[PDB]
Amino acid sequence: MLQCYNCPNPTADCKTAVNCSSDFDACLITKAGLQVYNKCWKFEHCNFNDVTTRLRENELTYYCCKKDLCNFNEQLEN
Template sequence: MRAQRGLILLLLLLAVFCSTAVSLKCYHCLDPVVSSCNMNSTCSPTQDTCLYAVSGMQVYQQCWKRSDCHTEVIMNLLEVAKVKFRCCQFNLCNKSEGSLGKTALLGTTVLVAILNLCFLSHL
């Protein structure tokens, strides 16, 4: 009985994670003056990653393809000579640099709590 509950919980978690991958949301702002980006968009099925890139004063936050997360490709597609960037794959993860640490810490804490519940249900 406990094994069945654990399996059901695992399947539920997989369904949640799979459904979020289909409808990834990313911040979508291309404004070098505004430091806080609050606009977001739902990515198309071909865009499986959020991009945060900076080139000079220009900041790019948008949906992106994981296979295009390489310096040369980003510089070419954004038509910039120099770029610092990061790609991530969970909802709204392409926030400005200052808030990334808090988001990652919160996500890790939630994931650990979920995994602990899974293991406790097997005892």
């Protein structure tokens, strides 16, 4: 199963490590200056429009990676 950091709420160093539901096939990281997010995600949803729509409001920077728990803060410099 894909396993990513998937914290429910913004976490500058998400430690909450989970297997993702089959809805997901990528590990997301996101940085928006004051906030950071790490999620179970889809490589198709790893785009600015999806992330900014799926994150409830407006702009951000994002990254996605394939490896187990690969979505971790250092992945993005923002």
